[PDB]
Design a binder for these strands. Structure first.
Lengths: 183, 182, 182, 183
DNA sequence: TCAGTGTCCGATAATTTAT
DNA sequence: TTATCGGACACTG
DNA sequence: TCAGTGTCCGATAATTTAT
DNA sequence: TTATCGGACACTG
DNA sequence: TCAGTGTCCGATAATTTAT
DNA sequence: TTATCGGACACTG
DNA sequence: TCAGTGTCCGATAATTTAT
DNA sequence: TTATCGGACACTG
């Protein structure tokens, strides 16, 4: 009975296609999938909240890998428990377990917290390797896309600030920031 | 600061045997907290108290890990709270603290594999019982009143009230006895 | 073909309570095997037998998983043997068989986390004992002979042999008694 | 006291350099490392057998990740047990555990068999994705590096077979194989 | 003193499949 | 997994 | 011929710590 | 682990 | 009827670090 | 994490 | 004023299955 | 889980 597929992304890319094509592949219907994209912190995975609602006693959700049904373990279990309360299991295709039975769920918890700990360590590296470049004089973030030499030229040549922002189609504040910064 | 939390769910006084295990692990009595649990989830008021009277640099001891939580989802919440509060929990018998970031992993595995085996017991108990039940095993409180007496009075045609007075027993009982034994 | 292996290491007859658990799980007595273990690692001769009398398509039942192996390294060898022999093991109480390829994983985790807790008990027992020992607890067999008797004879100057004859006790004992109680 | 580093490879490449530079990095001495390369099935990881021998009670071995101290779990434990018998622990740098104590070893066993099961599944895919290409008419293995059209030309033009292999500096058998195959 | 022919095979080489 | 090198081994001149 | 003294030790039974 | 048991062994009378 | 100036800030954009 | 856009908000003409 | 009949039920105590 | 207890409630005399 009823077979629903969930998918997700966080790489902020079209990585999405491979996932959904694995669901449909393993016998899902296009009219039974739901997806969520990464917006930021608050991003309340809207689609999933809907999923919860249109599934009934004797359904199964398919998920590609594990870390697609929510981020950290705490959520993962609650999330699972929510489903198990409506009477619904989850197959994880690649990882091979199912929220089908007692013994499974455990494996999901174990398997989870193995990584949520393996995660916390990749950071400690990705971070350290980030900071090491910082003090080594590496430039971070968005590239200065304004001709700042050209705007310093305006103010020094005593002229109204708003007028300036009206001549390059830019924000007013920015012009104040630019100069209030570079003196 | 050295704190000890304890718990007992058998509705027993096994508490005094657990609290010693920490009293002997260095914890002073002013800094121990307990909980009798007897029907709900809000009965962790003794912990509710601890959960506040602690500060950064403290450590709380618990005998076995399965006393602190219940289901692993409660477990992690409990850890997590204390965690970013700045306290650590150390499990005496089991031999882990949440000190290391890798402690936490164990603390989760170690339990979700218990919580598995715990749920198995339940499933395996109900059936073990249900089995016994049908096989002929009498249940609950032992019948204590001499029932063959009360019936005798009634079959001898005697108003109910009288009967409950001449054995100093409850009237409902009389009625129950005879309402049941027919 | 439905096979059941069993084991008991307490040096007890708890065997008959385990063997029933499979006799009642469908296994016929012709197809059950046991082992008393009492001092070595070669005493799995009852399994040595099973390990051969089985073929492809069979299944062996075991009550709890920790009866089949000892340390997890033995566990996996045992599984592995049966595995590429074509038989499967199903753990009654625990509720896993080595049937699925993912069963095997559990069977390993499930145990290495036991084998942990098992080793902890040992460490925690030795100390619990050693503790008691020094605190004043007498150990081993209870002294049964009336020692105050034997000494009386000797302090009364009586050849040892006589003494062991007039209580029908061992001569070494006499000597031991008096060699000890001075 | 004494700190020994083990490293290993199997990708049959110079992947080796990154590993050893992580050992030396985490405080090892060049004169305390040992390495093994992948030869095939029998490859008895010679270096490691030597390692076992020159370490004593109160040493520690460093290993980059986990799957470098032997392949499958069964070995992994035996291997470990061998060391623990001489009284020697193992730190695994990236994975973060140590054969230091009871509770660790377990984690190593768990952590191991999680993957040795996750391994067995990658195969089932890498295999299926291999076979799918097979029937789809994909050509497998070593490329035919002989001018076979030129050797068929020799035999059909009735000439001694050995002579042939003496004119292209090739193996005799090959010439028989070539023709005994392509007719 | 070897001399060439036709099989069958372990050992290396060069490739390919998907994480 | 498929392609080549070297050879050992049985015949036959 | 056989009787006793005293030290040691392998083979059982008895008991214990802790779940 | 300790207790008790037969029973071997080396001297002694 | 707005009219321009100088701060301080949430929301998006475009980047970078190492598995 | 750093750069830009839009604005709301307090003054001042 | 007050006495009895009979049904229900919340509040304790008593007991049990299984480790 | 069942047993026993006081004690409320609706009728009845």
């Amino acid at each position: 009975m009823a077979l629903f597929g969930y998918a997700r992304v966080s790489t902020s890319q079209q990585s999405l296609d491979i996932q959904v094509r694995a669901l449909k592949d393993a016998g899902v219907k296009a009219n039974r999938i739901f997806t969520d994209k990464a917006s930021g912190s608050s991003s309340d995975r809207k689609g999933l909240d809907l999923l919860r609602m249109k599934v009934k006693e004797g359904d199964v959700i398919l998920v590609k890998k594990l870390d697609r049904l929510g981020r950290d373990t705490a959520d993962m279990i609650q999330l699972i428990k929510e489903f198990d309360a409506q009477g619904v299991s989850i197959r994880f295709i690649d990882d091979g377990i199912s929220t089908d039975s007692y013994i499974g769920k455990m494996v999901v918890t174990i398997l989870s917290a193995v990584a949520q700990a393996e995660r916390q360590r990749i950071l400690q590296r990705t971070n350290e390797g980030r900071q090491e470049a910082m003090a080594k004089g590496v430039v971070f973030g968005r590239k200065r896309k304004i001709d700042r030499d050209a705007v310093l030229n305006m103010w020094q040549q005593g002229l109204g600030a708003s007028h300036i922002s009206k001549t390059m189609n830019i924000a007013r504040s920015t012009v104040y920031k630019v100069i209030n910064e570079s003196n």
